Design a protein around this ligand. Structure first.
Ligand code: HEM
Length: 451
């Protein structure tokens, strides 16, 4: 099996000691091909980049979701929430059964108003900028997505558009996620050097737990019913076990929604706007749709569904730069991958999503080009060729939420403003848990359409 360059006893590990590991892995896939082994002291995995191999990896009878070391560290604060639990843990299937109906396309009808609440706040912020000011795109998109998940998730207002420094919960979450990431490179995690890191990590966990537990407590105490996920989780029963989610798991689910949803969704909106300003023909087409469809002061649920080309723009942005990181799988039993690669029970695979989305054998030779017209379309897309939301029963539960949010917001943005790439911005992709176009800025000239 092809394998990248080695660093003696550290094997391939220093290759991910970099600000941009996913992009580094994409460059390794370019020179090595559809499969490569990646080794670290005491660990091994296999990175998959072709639809040919990924299609097999997506066979749930042969492979199940694995928690990468990253997710294992994130579990220290995300607990046995949906994102960081194993399929075979009682709490996975229990929460999946309870939550699935609350995340359906139909359920988006109930979240729409609160999504509009935050989206209007974003539009108003931009309406209120002075002539010689610009927009920090990923920064504002993250304010939007955090507040939207906060409001829709547990009826809590982070009020991100009222501050420079985020709500302490947000600061703690971002810092806990960065520390979970830092542990990946620590050969001696018990070194005194990390004592402060550990102290801060426990502090950040407490900040998050305290806020969420308080909100849950407050809600049970009042008996208040809201249009949020928390109300669903307090009222829900798993048809299988007949059990409701306990308070601690509910807390983990709320933290999980924020971890899994905020940056992935923010990144999507940021990349979508990036591609639009770099492809003014596409922007014109999307803006025509936005103006024709969104005829009311605020968008209705029905109208968002009709933003078809905006949806296509978003899928094409997800094709080129899927914002969620490569996901991990393990072999359920001994099995041979692609007729060439025997695997043992427990062997791990990684699905290198951005590479899959550039499989010139699936998409044609023009994979690097931004063409929403690819998604006209749809479902002609070969099965397992487009996987920004993961796979099977362990796919993104929030997919309908993310797309409704992104379509609504992008539509409003295109209805309300003309955008200028005033710096001729050079794409620079920052990686945290997720990808974003770092330092992407634009100027927005209002079309002066009232809300
Ligand atoms: C463009 C935005 C998003 C993208 C690209 C994305 C991507 C993904 C991917 C790839 C997975 C599978 C991870 C794995 O196999 O380890 C996943 C799972 C998940 N996502 Fe999303 N996500 C997005 C938005 C959201 C939002 C907004 C929410 C919540 C409101 C959310 C909640 C979850 C949860 C709970 C899981 C675990 C589901 C389960 O395994 O039962 N995501 N997401």
């Amino acid at each position: 099996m092809p394998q990248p360059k080695t660093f003696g006893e550290l094997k391939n590990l220093p290759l991910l000691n970099t600000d941009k590991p996913v992009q580094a892995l994409m460059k390794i896939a370019d020179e090595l091909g559809e499969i490569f082994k990646f080794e670290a002291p005491g660990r091994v995995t296999r990175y998959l980049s072709s639809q040919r191999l990924i299609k097999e990896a997506c066979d749930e009878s042969r492979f199940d979701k694995n928690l990468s070391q990253a997710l294992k560290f994130v579990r220290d604060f995300a607990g046995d929430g949906l994102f960081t639990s194993w399929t075979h843990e009682k709490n996975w299937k229990k929460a999946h059964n309870i939550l699935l109906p609350s995340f359906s396309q139909q359920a988006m009808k109930g979240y729409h108003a609160m999504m509009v609440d935050i989206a209007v706040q974003l539009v108003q912020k931009w309406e209120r900028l002075n002539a010689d000011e610009h927009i920090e795109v990923p920064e504002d998109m993250t304010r939007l997505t955090l507040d939207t998940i906060g409001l829709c998730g547990f009826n809590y207002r982070f009020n991100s558009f009222y501050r420079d420094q985020p709500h302490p919960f947000i600061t703690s979450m971002v810092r806990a996620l960065d520390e979970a990431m830092n542990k990946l490179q620590r050969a001696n995690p018990d070194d005194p050097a990390y004592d402060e890191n550990k102290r801060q990590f426990q502090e950040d966990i407490k900040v998050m737990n305290d806020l969420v537990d308080k909100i849950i407590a407050d809600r049970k105490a009042s008996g208040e019913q809201s249009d949020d996920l928390l109300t669903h989780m307090l009222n829900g029963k798993d048809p299988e076990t007949g059990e409701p989610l306990d308070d601690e798991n509910i807390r983990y689910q709320i933290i999980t929604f924020l971890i899994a949803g905020h940056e992935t969704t923010s990144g999507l909106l940021s990349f979508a706007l990036y591609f639009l300003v770099k492809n003014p023909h596409v922007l014109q087409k999307a803006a025509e749709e936005a103006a024709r469809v969104l005829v009311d002061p605020v968008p209705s649920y029905k109208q968002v569904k009709q933003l078809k080309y905006v949806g296509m723009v978003l899928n094409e942005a997800l094709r080129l730069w899927p914002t969620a990181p490569p996901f991990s799988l393990y072999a359920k039993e001994d099995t041979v991958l692609g007729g060439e690669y025997p695997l043992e029970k427990g062997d791990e695979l990684m699905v290198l999503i951005p590479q899959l989305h550039r499989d010139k054998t699936i998409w044609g030779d023009d994979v690097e080009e931004f063409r929403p017209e690819r998604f006209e379309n749809p479902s002609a897309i070969p099965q397992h060729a487009f996987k920004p939301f993961g796979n099977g029963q362990r796919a993104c539960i929030g997919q309908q939420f993310a797309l409704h949010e992104a379509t609504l917001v992008l539509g409003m943005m295109l209805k309300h403003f003309d955008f200028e790439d005033h710096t001729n911005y050079e794409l620079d992709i920052k990686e945290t848990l997720t990808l974003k176009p770092e330092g992407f800025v634009v100027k927005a000239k209002s079309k002066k359409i009232p809300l």
